């Protein structure tokens, strides 16, 4: 009956794709070789979040707690809230909601309570300027990530209101047979409860890296003061390369910690963005999983997306193996007729998925 | 390996020595009807040219078996009765389900008694819906939404218009149409018209919230100006304490409110009205009790019978009553009379 997976990898993506597919899954061997075995607290809170979002779905956890039986239900959404644990940020929970978001009964307005940013997870402006425009060109129109207050690790206290209210039926079919000529480069530099000079030091490190191109560099700043600042100090920087002619963007971001330099963080986010621009073909390796997830859950049609040689990782191909396990779809990587690059074009016939929850 | 959302980069020293320069990526830097028809034609020809690829990839595993491709298909666990009673006059009609239609739950539709069907349709009377490929007997419950506030349970479908309905079945997509037939046998095909309900599916859900109005009638027994002691709609002071402060009204539209549980008789209370009610009135507390849909689902399966008509499923309430000769429930003070007013003369 249940589609069974081994190991607690791709856990969010497995729960999300089971929700989209309507196929009941089991995830067995959740970290069997460990002194405290089983699900982590952020994983259990994610299952609580999926229980709040969907309806008619049972989630079974074993008495040892090292396996799960997710029977998906109808995505119904609604206005809710979510007190995420302090072990993971709110990017870890607003990342999967972008998948399930425009395919619900009611429109999504969930606000998350917890740490805004982390090192190995999605920032707020990362989510916004990278993973909103890929949705806005995959079919949604009115999606929003309001920030009401932000919180640095660990004490946090940051609240973020995801609200999407354009419920499409299925994502449109993407046709990207070009390398997007980068129109400009913008960025934001934020700080919670430190001096308003370290932000300028961040953007000075970033502009001294990016100065050698004749393109337009522009980085806005936001210091957060008062009750909108959180319960801990911190600082961070996000650079986004922007191609306006198709609306594409590629981002990089990092936060600083106890004993770092904002000039180092500006130059580090700038050089990480430059490596993303090297290994980038119209989608970043960060924006890639949900972009191809929308491509597969589109209409019964062929959608084409030009992706380059370096985006293909073990992470990418375990994404492809797992999506084929969940609803049986191959991607055809054809090559292009030019050899000054290595751009495959991923063509996917989308499954016949529609938003069958909506009242009409 | 995908909990880590931020992609993998190298170490900062190597990356800074690499990205001292920029030049390798400097080449990256620098009528309406016929319009829609042209767009969808362009999409179809794109589909055709990128199907023009590896042939067994296409014809098996990237799309598979387009249309008119003659196929054989091995099903398993097909029961004994199909192969035993296989008569080829009746067709063998297969249709592949979409991922929603393998599910179950409550379907909210709007339906309508057919304009040629003679008899009205009653809630919790079974009828055989034809919903997509499936046909199944089920028990609908016909709801109204009284000026878009509640979803409350009518007891019949209305005569000449569309009501709503909710039934436990498979979950087709919204905006699909369906028929519904009372009877499917030929021994009781009668003379009249057979298909009874029609409609479209408006919404699918896994839980509906429908209510039926129960009014708690009580009577007055001690009436002053503007306040009255009400006799029996509750049985005890605990029940009246549970229902303090509610709004009641008589049948004459005189509003009022439950003020306090009386002490000495158990189920009596004090209510204050708009003006002086009379002893001949009935006070009323409109409140809402929830009702459930019945999760009764049997498909027809008439290709599994020895005669393939004469499919007899669950009967209707009139047939049950006439079978075991139960007289219909007739409340005697519910029927109407010809009320003849006197003249109204005051002192």
């Amino acid at each position: 009956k249940y589609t069974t997976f081994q190991g607690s990898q791709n856990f969010r993506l497995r729960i999300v794709l089971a929700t989209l597919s309507g196929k009941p899954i089991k995830i067995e061997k959740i970290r069997s070789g460990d002194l405290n075995p089983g699900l982590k607290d952020y994983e259990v809170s994610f299952l609580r979040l999926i229980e709040s979002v969907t309806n008619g779905s049972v989630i079974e956890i074993s008495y040892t707690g090292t396996t799960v039986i997710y029977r998906p239900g109808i995505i119904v959404g609604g206005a809710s809230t979510h007190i995420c644990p302090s072990s993971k940020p709110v990017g870890y929970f607003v990342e999967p909601m972008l998948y399930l978001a425009p395919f619900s009964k009611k429109k999504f307005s969930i606000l998350f309570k917890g740490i805004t940013a982390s090192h190995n997870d999605a920032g707020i402006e990362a989510i916004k300027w990278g993973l909103m425009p890929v949705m806005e060109k995959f079919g949604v129109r009115e999606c929003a990530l309001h920030t009401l207050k932000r919180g640095s690790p660990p004490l946090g206290g940051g609240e973020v209101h995801l609200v999407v209210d354009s419920l499409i039926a299925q994502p449109i079919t993407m046709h990207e047979i070009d390398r997007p000529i980068i129109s400009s480069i913008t960025g934001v530099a934020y700080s919670t409860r430190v001096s308003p000079s370290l932000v300028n030091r961040m953007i000075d490190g970033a502009k001294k890296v990016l100065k050698n191109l004749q393109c337009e560099v522009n980085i806005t700043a936001d210091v957060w003061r008062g009750e909108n600042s959180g319960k801990s100090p911190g600082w961070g920087i996000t650079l986004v390369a922007q191609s306006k002619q198709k609306g594409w963007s590629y981002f990089a971001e990092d936060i600083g910690d106890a004993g770092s330099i904002p000039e180092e963080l500006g130059e580090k986010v700038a050089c990480q963005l430059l490596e993303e621009i090297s290994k980038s073909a119209a989608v970043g390796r960060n924006q890639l999983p949900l972009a191809i997830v929308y491509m597969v859950i589109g209409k019964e049609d062929i959608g084409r997306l030009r992706i380059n040689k370096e985006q293909i990782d073990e992470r990418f191909i375990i994404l492809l193996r797992d999506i084929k396990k969940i609803f049986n779809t191959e991607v055809f990587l054809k090559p292009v007729d030019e050899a000054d690059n290595e751009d495959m074009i991923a063509t996917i016939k989308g499954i016949g998925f529609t938003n069958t929850s909506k009242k009409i | 390996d995908l909990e880590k959302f931020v992609p993998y980069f190298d170490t900062f020293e190597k990356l800074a020595k690499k990205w001292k320069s920029v030049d390798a990526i400097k080449e990256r830097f620098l009528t309406w009807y016929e319009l829609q028809k042209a767009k969808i034609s362009k999409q179809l020809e794109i589909n055709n040219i990128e199907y023009q690829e590896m042939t067994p990839e296409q014809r098996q595993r990237i799309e598979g078996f387009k249309a008119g491709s003659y196929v054989r298909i091995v099903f398993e666990k097909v029961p004994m009765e199909f192969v035993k009673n296989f008569n080829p006059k009746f067709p063998i009609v297969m249709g592949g389900l979409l991922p929603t239609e393998i599910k179950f739950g409550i379907v909210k539709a709007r339906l309508r008694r057919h304009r040629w069907h003679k008899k009205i349709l009653k809630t919790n009377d079974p009828l055989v819906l034809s919903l997509g490929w499936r046909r199944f007997q089920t028990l609908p419950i016909y709801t109204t939404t009284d000026s878009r506030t509640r979803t409350r349970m009518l007891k019949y479908t209305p005569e000449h218009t569309y009501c709503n309905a909710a039934f436990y079945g498979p979950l087709c997509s919204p905006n699909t149409p369906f028929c519904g037939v009372q009877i499917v046998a030929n021994s009781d095909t009668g003379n009249g018209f057979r298909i009874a309900a029609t409609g479209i599916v408006e919404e699918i859900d896994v839980n509906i919230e429908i209510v039926k109005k129960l009014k708690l009638v009580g009577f007055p027994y001690k009436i002053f100006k503007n306040t009255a002691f009400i006799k029996d709609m509750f049985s005890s002071a605990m029940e009246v304490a549970r229902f303090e402060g509610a709004q009641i009204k008589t049948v004459s539209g005189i509003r009022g409110e439950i003020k306090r549980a009386l002490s000495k008789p158990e189920g009596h209370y004090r209510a204050a009205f708009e003006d002086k009610i009379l002893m001949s009135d009935i006070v009323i507390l409109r409140s809402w009790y929830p009702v459930r849909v019945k999760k009764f689902y049997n498909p027809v399966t008439s290709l599994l019978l020895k005669e393939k008509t004469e499919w007899k499923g669950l009967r209707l309430t009139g047939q049950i009553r006439a079978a075991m000769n139960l007289e219909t429930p007739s409340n005697p003070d519910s029927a109407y009379h010809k009320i003849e007013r006197v003249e109204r003369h005051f002192n």
Partner: peptide
């Protein structure tokens, strides 16, 4: 008011 319109449930047996 949380319970009024749900059917599913996280079933922790730990």
């Amino acid at each position: 008011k949380m319970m009024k319109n749900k059917r599913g449930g996280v079933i922790d047996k730990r």
